[PDB]
Amino acid sequence: SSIVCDNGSGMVKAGFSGDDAPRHVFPSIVGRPKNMQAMMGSANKTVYVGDEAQSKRGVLSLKYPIEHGIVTNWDDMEKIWHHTFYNELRVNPEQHNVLLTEAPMNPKQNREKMTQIMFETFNVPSLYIGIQAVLSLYSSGRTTGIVLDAGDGVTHTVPIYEGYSLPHAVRRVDMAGRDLTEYLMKIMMETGTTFTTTAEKEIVRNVKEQLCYVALDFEEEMTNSAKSANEEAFELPDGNVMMVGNQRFRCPEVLFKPSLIGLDEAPGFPEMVYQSINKCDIDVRRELYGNIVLSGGSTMFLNLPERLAKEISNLAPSSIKPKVVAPPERKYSVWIGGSILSSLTTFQTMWVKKSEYDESGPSIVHNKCF
Amino acid sequence: SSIVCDNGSGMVKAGFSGDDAPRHVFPSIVGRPKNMQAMMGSANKTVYVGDEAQSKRGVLSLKYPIEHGIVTNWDDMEKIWHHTFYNELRVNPEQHNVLLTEAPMNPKQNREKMTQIMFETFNVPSLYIGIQAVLSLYSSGRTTGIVLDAGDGVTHTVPIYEGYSLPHAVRRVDMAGRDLTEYLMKIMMETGTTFTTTAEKEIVRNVKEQLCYVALDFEEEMTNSAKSANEEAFELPDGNVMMVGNQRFRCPEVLFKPSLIGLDEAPGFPEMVYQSINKCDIDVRRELYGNIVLSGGSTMFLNLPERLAKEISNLAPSSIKPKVVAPPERKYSVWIGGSILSSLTTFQTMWVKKSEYDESGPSIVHNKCF
Amino acid sequence: SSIVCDNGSGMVKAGFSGDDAPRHVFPSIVGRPKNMQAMMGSANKTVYVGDEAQSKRGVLSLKYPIEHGIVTNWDDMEKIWHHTFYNELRVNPEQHNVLLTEAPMNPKQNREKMTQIMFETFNVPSLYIGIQAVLSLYSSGRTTGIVLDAGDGVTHTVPIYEGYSLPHAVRRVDMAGRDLTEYLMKIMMETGTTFTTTAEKEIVRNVKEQLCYVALDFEEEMTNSAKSANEEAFELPDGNVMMVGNQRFRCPEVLFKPSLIGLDEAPGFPEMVYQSINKCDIDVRRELYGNIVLSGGSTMFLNLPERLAKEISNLAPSSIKPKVVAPPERKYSVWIGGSILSSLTTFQTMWVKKSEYDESGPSIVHNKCF
Amino acid sequence: SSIVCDNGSGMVKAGFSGDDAPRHVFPSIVGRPKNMQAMMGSANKTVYVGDEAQSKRGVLSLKYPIEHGIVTNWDDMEKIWHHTFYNELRVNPEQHNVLLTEAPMNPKQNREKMTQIMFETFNVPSLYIGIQAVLSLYSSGRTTGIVLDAGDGVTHTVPIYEGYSLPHAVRRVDMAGRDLTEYLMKIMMETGTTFTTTAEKEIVRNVKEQLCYVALDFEEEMTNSAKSANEEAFELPDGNVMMVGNQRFRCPEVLFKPSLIGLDEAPGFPEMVYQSINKCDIDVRRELYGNIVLSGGSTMFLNLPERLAKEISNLAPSSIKPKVVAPPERKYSVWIGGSILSSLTTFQTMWVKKSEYDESGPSIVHNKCF
Amino acid sequence: SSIVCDNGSGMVKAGFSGDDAPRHVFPSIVGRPKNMQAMMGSANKTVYVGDEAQSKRGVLSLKYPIEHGIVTNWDDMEKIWHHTFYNELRVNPEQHNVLLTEAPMNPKQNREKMTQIMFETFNVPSLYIGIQAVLSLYSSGRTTGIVLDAGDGVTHTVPIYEGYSLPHAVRRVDMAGRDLTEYLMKIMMETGTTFTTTAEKEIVRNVKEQLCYVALDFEEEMTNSAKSANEEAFELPDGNVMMVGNQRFRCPEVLFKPSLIGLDEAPGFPEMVYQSINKCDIDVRRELYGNIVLSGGSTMFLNLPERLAKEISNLAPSSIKPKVVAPPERKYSVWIGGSILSSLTTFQTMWVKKSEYDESGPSIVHNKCF
Ligand SMILES: Nc1ncnc2c1ncn2[C@@H]1O[C@H](COP(=O)(O)OP(=O)(O)O)[C@@H](O)[C@H]1O
Ligand SMILES: Nc1ncnc2c1ncn2[C@@H]1O[C@H](COP(=O)(O)OP(=O)(O)O)[C@@H](O)[C@H]1O
Ligand SMILES: Nc1ncnc2c1ncn2[C@@H]1O[C@H](COP(=O)(O)OP(=O)(O)O)[C@@H](O)[C@H]1O
Ligand SMILES: Nc1ncnc2c1ncn2[C@@H]1O[C@H](COP(=O)(O)OP(=O)(O)O)[C@@H](O)[C@H]1O
Ligand SMILES: Nc1ncnc2c1ncn2[C@@H]1O[C@H](COP(=O)(O)OP(=O)(O)O)[C@@H](O)[C@H]1O
Ligand SMILES: [Mg+2]
Numbered sequence A, B, C, D, E: 001s002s003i004v005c006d007n008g009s010g011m012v013k014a015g016f017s018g019d020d021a022p023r024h025v026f027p028s029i030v031g032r033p034k035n036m037q038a039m040m041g042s043a044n045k046t047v048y049v050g051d052e053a054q055s056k057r058g059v060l061s062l063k064y065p066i067e068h069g070i071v072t073n074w075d076d077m078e079k080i081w082h083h084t085f086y087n088e089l090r091v092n093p094e095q096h097n098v099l100l101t102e103a104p105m106n107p108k109q110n111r112e113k114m115t116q117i118m119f120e121t122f123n124v125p126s127l128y129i130g131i132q133a134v135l136s137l138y139s140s141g142r143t144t145g146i147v148l149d150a151g152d153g154v155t156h157t158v159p160i161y162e163g164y165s166l167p168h169a170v171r172r173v174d175m176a177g178r179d180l181t182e183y184l185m186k187i188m189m190e191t192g193t194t195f196t197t198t199a200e201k202e203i204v205r206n207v208k209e210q211l212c213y214v215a216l217d218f219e220e221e222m223t224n225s226a227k228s229a230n231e232e233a234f235e236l237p238d239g240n241v242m243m244v245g246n247q248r249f250r251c252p253e254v255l256f257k258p259s260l261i262g263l264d265e266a267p268g269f270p271e272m273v274y275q276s277i278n279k280c281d282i283d284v285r286r287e288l289y290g291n292i293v294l295s296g297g298s299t300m301f302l303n304l305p306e307r308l309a310k311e312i313s314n315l316a317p318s319s320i321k322p323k324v325v326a327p328p329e330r331k332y333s334v335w336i337g338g339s340i341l342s343s344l345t346t347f348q349t350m351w352v353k354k355s356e357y358d359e360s361g362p363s364i365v366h367n368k369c370f
């Protein structure tokens, strides 16, 4: 069959074409022990990948091969790929077509080396590398709209009008869920709870995923929370309980004002969409405003679509009624679109055969894959 | 075969690998006469080791070569080793592998000189020196847990998570059964029975081993015993009978509050475990609380595990349910774990060959033995 | 005396009439701090203009008052003017005549408000606003020719035949050095070097000004550079070194094919000149082809005049031999022409006196200034 | 006048504004007796603060109110403050302005309660709480640079460029002189000298302050010291002499590799500075490399600045020449900077008046004090 | 007033508070006739106490109620107390406060029954029982030091540092002047003079008090005395003269080596002090070495302080200079300290009132008296 592997910065989503949801979602981490093994043969493993690293994180040093959508450690990335194939999918990579995803405006060498590893190390017969926002637009079952995809390493905006790309209106900000997690971990020190190790960063990520929400009116929420002192209790793995105060709505606020983490000139979620739309031709802006698609796990915060729609409406002219489409399953929207695309009968001629790679070498994906 | 010799401060336990219990347990004492021999040839021995010294203790001055887990008299220690081999095991040390144990954070010169004596004086072919808490965890048949080992000279706490050492969470207090015996001998003077000689210290040790018990509630027990005047009779070797009052539960109480013997800042049995657990990573604390292993003869007091479990539960957060594992045979738990480890087929490459010692000299055990 | 101030989009050039070169050239930027001042009195300034903003750009947010030749921020523009007078020229504006320049076919309100600010805020006695291409033709010392001026915000083409204007043959494209800088900053992401802040945009501008060159044959250069992988090293301010590959000749290529930045229907440098010439009367085309004048800093790329002359010759009929005049000092050609014009004895009756402004109000410059 | 009180984790430094050095430096310890007073009226004191506790440490249990820059015992802290005012400065706190210091990214409640105690318990008229690194940069008489301050409880790095804060580039590691003292006390057990009581911890601290030095090449020093067995003699208070071997250069080595004390993922002295610089804007990094300021007593080890400068140069690009500024009086650099700041005529409007506290309550220092 | 009664094993010292010396010192003996009274009314007394028993010792059987500081005969002890009050002090015990002394670590029932007898049999209004070494330290007018008190039944060592007790460093050996007298009486049999009756034991005690001296070098003295045969003549009451040879310096030698009387493991005078000092904290040892206080009549031998100081200096480290304080009136040092303590105005609230005894019964002195 065909393999749809959505290698994200934080989570790896793998499966087969035609399915409605990925069958294997595990973190994109590689852990190694930081202490000598006192016993004999109990923990003989030297490298842990995926859920195994997450399970033993208390005695491991976790590492992310992908940073901001760019693979910074290729040995760990190929370890993750070997895991994803053999231990996760339990299929021979040589017998299946592999579909990969990548953020727009990534370095060319990243895609080139990814293709080289897929064709040589795993002997994949045919390969194709797509764009995450295009697949996210595919999954919604529409051919026109602007996709705001925010995952774990990068958020990008890609407008598409009736199937035609608008390459000069594509935005990209290296600010996503990992930056939010780091900011939350920093601002939790005010309450008196400091997390420093990589293992303790996962606890902060869980706090972010469970308690954080987007405030409808940040300034009003900030003042009312100051006096009422409303806070929620989060139970740490050791059994201790810590209280999370205004950090619940301050952590996702950095999406709407990235100056809180040093990105002073970064636009923010509504401003980036507005600028991307205004970079397009005047005749297509009205249909782009009326169809805004959210994707990625960093768009899953409570009240985020409503806040985004309210903020965009202020920027847009009074005759425009923006509509934000936030599917409940938008976390896996990229994988669903990739599965849909790979199941199309027209797409079967778009695969990059290994024979073509043997002829023209790398950078073949830079000409036919878009 | 292989020899598993657990040289403790008070008791020497020797045997062969594969056995379920040591075949020779005798005190680690060396006695010498303090009076001239009036008769001719009846008692021509000048040095007594082991049970012989204990049998003739009335006319001998007993000495312990090991103090607080550290050999303070090497001539007496090598006398004890010569006894343990020839008179006890009746085997040639040159034909067997010797496994030795040592408390954590001991001086390096102690282990170096022990290795030198084993390799040169006894010509042992291969040697290995382990850690008592690790072997105690081996004997329980588990790879995760925190071991509280309290013998005769020192009590130490060693956390181990899934076979990985946690060296920065290891505690060590030089307070064990010998200090309890001395405290009992001091507080028996209140009743009107003073023991001063080393021979009379063994009587106090027997009193401690037979009558002393840990009170579930020390303050309630102290008041009720004051009015009821409940006491038990202990028969001295000479035939006299002395009464032991509140000293039955006061003597082991110093384990839970070492300030009674001048160790004002020492933690105590539950506090030391709590601190050792809290020195570990937050992700491993929950599994360490749920598996606490007791070892050594000083943990054999009545109601000691129940009192320890109750005390630790107060310190631990309300979401934690500590479980204390106290095997009935925990006195020999270190030797059992050493026998199990030496019988493993993987361990056979971990012996320190005598050829290696001839090459790199001493301190070879500091690099490969842990 | 008289003041010749050439307020460009990127650079401000000021001086006095009769001089052969501007005495003060500084960027047209206004910077404001983005962080709170921790110390006391060291950096008490709140707004930085000119070279001061460029010097402290690492802690400032730089802004350009002029976009595409149109003043989009009048407060910052009047700050720049106040700087240019007092801190740069150190003369009283009330005592001198001011000569200003403006791109053709600009909005009328822009010139009206510029005149209002000059007459009211600075109390300038007499004012005149010219056209940059006319002054560029003045500086060459000729009365016939077609001027292709490309600065930082806009490129315009103005044909003049024997001193007579040809208003219906004037072209204007909002594509100049700033668009080239943005395109270079976008295409440097392929190598793996992303610049996002306004301060880092100046580094990209310096890269463009130092390394970029116009390829004689773009298609041949593109293929040969692909295989030879020829690239140059540029040292960033922090000390790091980044390699610039094919972006050296791709960045200025957008002048000859503006479709690379979304201006699909824009003509380009040779096509715009050809269309502007063909919009003129048939009797004047031959003399316009034989005298093409380049102006502005965006025409300073290596091999740009040769490439332009080759490209125009293909469009022109075979009986025409176009000649492109590219003076070495064409960056300041507008200012030189303004200085020459203001020093003419005939021009002294063309100033707009402040009394005339008090009578007819604004839009007086729309009738007598051309 | 004004009071400059630098409440550190280990040492309290107090004085008046305008002086070049603190007039009263005493340890921040509170001691209580652990034994009953046998005599009558000789030692009627029940709590000892400062040098008195240090003098009688042999019969006292010493406690540090401040841990890692955070006050963990407010009663002892206010005892220390009462001592510092009345017994040390011998002035009425109600008649003077008090300047306090605090580590960056401390819990907000710590500063709030400190302000509450100063305003209510001592009735201080006006108060101000600064940042230790900012004052350390003040004392050097420069407005640009990066300050590496390492005291007794925490080490922090604060970059400042031309007086503007860089809040997102501030690092903080809870590893300072007290952790070094604990590590030295642990590793002295290898030689055969165990210190356990709090009184004996001061002896280890004196050993660290007198004998420990930073090795220029740790690996080369470790091997050469192993064979030469070079060691120095330290005389204990009782008159005994103990030998300190490789622990002289191993104890301060944990600053450059904090994994020796369980901080496996902590950066270390050069790595923390490098990361803090690289968190800043590219335009300011070159000036931050060329001006590195050391502060605190934990930076006073021999050859520490040279080792740090060598280590940073390897991390920095080859075009960068880092310069480390280590004033001889850098132990009191924070107090000197505080005295300089409080003597400035501009600073006199920055005090938090008690009337303001009565109006807005606490957290007033969170808005105007930085 | 107040009564200071120092009930020793051999001598009873009584007096009133404020005096510089006891006004009544008599032996603590009770004698009874061993023969029938032949005459009529000449010697009608049946029990003799004090000097009367000593005067008629030739026809009486003398008995000591106190053995090793413990009252073994309460009827004789209360006879001695009745004598000491009525026949010696000639005051009503009901009208005075009584201060009593007791050796440390005595049985609790001894003190309880002493208090019961004082409160019930003699109807003493208020009572207090102190420690002999504490009072001996009081008499020297110092609050720090280590007291070596050796009387007639027991020698004990009590360190005190700045008024704070060090209970875990207190030593006690049941070997004092009576054991020396018995040893002298045994070793006088070698010369040919056997004393067996209790009356003849007093002659041996007088010989010990008049002729015995401590040898500076025992081994050198033993050899030189063997050849020179130097001996002194002692006149018995009957008029006979016996010669005392090497027994002059052998009798007090048992203090420095108690193995001569079967106390093989007893430390001896310098060893006991050294061990008691080393049981203390390291910070207080230096001041304890420099202040050693001698007390009791068994320390009155010639050259004893010099020999003790020489012996201790060998044990102490080379950096220590021990100083032994031996007041000329150290025999009554305990009584002087008791008189000083009872005259303090602060001590007046420390008396145990008879009403308190009626409420809480006995063992009240175990809580408030120390
Ligand atoms: N329910 C949630 N609410 C808020 N944030 C979430 C939620 N689930 C995941 N996230 C954030 O989204 C990130 C994962 O996004 P994902 O789409 O998996 O990224 P990628 O596409 O790189 O795999 C995590 O870092 C997490 O912080
Ligand atoms: N049944 C018992 N109850 C209480 N204490 C005991 C008991 N048996 C032994 N002990 C104490 O434990 C000590 C022996 O412990 P052990 O484990 O033999 O030490 P080591 O490991 O050094 O040989 C003795 O000093 C004794 O006081
Ligand atoms: N030597 C050069 N080579 C290439 N481009 C240059 C050079 N010098 C300046 N430029 C470009 O020209 C622009 C400045 O042109 P200028 O004539 O100063 O514009 P204006 O007329 O608006 O002041 C800059 O944005 C820069 O990108
Ligand atoms: N000369 C020295 N050499 C090495 N370390 C020192 C020296 N003096 C002090 N220290 C260490 O520095 C610490 C005191 O630093 P200090 O700046 O007083 O901290 P704080 O700012 O918290 O008062 C002590 O714990 C000590 O270990
Ligand atoms: N001048 C002396 N020289 C040597 N020993 C003496 C001297 N005087 C008394 N003694 C010894 O000291 C003992 C008396 O000591 P004392 O302090 O009275 O004891 P207590 O404190 O029990 O009353 C006697 O047994 C005697 O042997
Ligand atoms: Mg994704």
Ligand SMILES: [Mg+2]
Pocket (backbone or CB within 6 Å): B006, B007, B008, B009, B132, B151, B152, B296, B334
């Ligand atoms: Mg043991």
Ligand SMILES: [Mg+2]
Pocket (backbone or CB within 6 Å): C006, C007, C008, C009, C132, C151, C152, C296, C334
């Ligand atoms: Mg211009």
Ligand SMILES: [Mg+2]
Pocket (backbone or CB within 6 Å): D006, D007, D008, D009, D132, D151, D152, D296, D334
């Ligand atoms: Mg400090």
Ligand SMILES: [Mg+2]
Pocket (backbone or CB within 6 Å): E006, E007, E008, E009, E132, E151, E152, E296, E334
């Ligand atoms: Mg006495």
